[PDB]
């Protein structure tokens, strides 16, 4: 939950940057389903078994 | 930060030119570590530069 600042440099042009942070600090993450991924991997494996 | 501390950001302060062509004021901003590189071989941990 970051917030933006406004620093003006030069004539009529501004540069944005992250300032303070409000709320507890946490870590970004990514999520995938396990069973679907395993089934897809097995399907790809059996399809690849023909060549090897 | 007020709520704690974060390891993936650094609080960098630097001088920037105002609307006046020759006049500088201090400003601050939080920057991610990968975009921060040590300046010179002189091991002065208080100085840094963008990766540019």
């Amino acid at each position, epitope marked *: 939950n970051n917030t933006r600042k406004s620093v003006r440099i030069g004539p009529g042009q501004t540069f944005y940057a992250t300032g303070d942070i409000i709320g507890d600090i*946490k870590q970004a993450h990514c999520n995938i389903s396990e069973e679907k991924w395993n089934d897809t991997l097995q399907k790809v494996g059996i399809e690849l078994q023909k060549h090897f | 930060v007020k709520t*704690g501390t974060v390891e993936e950001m650094k609080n960098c302060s630097f001088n920037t030119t105002t609307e006046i062509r020759d006049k500088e004021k201090k400003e601050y901003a939080l920057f991610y570590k990968p975009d921060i590189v040590p300046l010179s071989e002189t091991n002065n941990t208080s100085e840094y530069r963008l990766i540019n």
Partner: antibody
Amino acid sequence: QVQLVQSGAEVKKPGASVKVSCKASGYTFTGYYMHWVRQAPGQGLEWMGWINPNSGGTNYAQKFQGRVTMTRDTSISTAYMELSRLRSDDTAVYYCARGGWISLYYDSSGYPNFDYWGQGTLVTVSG
Amino acid sequence: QSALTQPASVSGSPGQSITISCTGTSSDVGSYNLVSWYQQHPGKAPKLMIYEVSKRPSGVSNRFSGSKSGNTASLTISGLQAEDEADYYCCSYAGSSTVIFGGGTKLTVLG
């Protein structure tokens, strides 16, 4: 069962500083936040702030910026709240409450659901 | 402060259904589903009665209930008894990792 206890009673001069200790048992102290609340006699109770015992981070509501400091001791699993610049209207009761679960993936500090409480502690400023 | 506006007191006879309201601006309760109702007897510490206004706690009877609509929540008690004589408060999440409590009320039993 889960148990929470605090100090018996405390009395201090006006404008002085006081400290309150709250201890918990029956569950892991590093797995949950800790909320602190104040209740004046016969008036609506006010929420002061919350503290995370893992990294020591704390947050407080307005009207208390810099006047109250909350820390903890993980080895003995206790929470300490220190207040300064007491006022005549500070005669009240204080309670510590167990909030949400520390997930490290989604924020849970702001959830207002806390169930386990303690007997509290009474503070008075006669003067 | 700009806490949650709440009535003063209510009353009802045993076996009667009585509801108490608690309202606030959109930021406090309108934009979020995080609400809680707390029961407090004199002297003893308060005890909570509902999670997110809908999910009931464990070990709590089915007499109490709660529901939110628009920018106001309502706590309903069915089958009043002598055990409900206590104070009731509404609290919610005010944004930016803050919690705000309501003014509170008192419940009286007729007869």
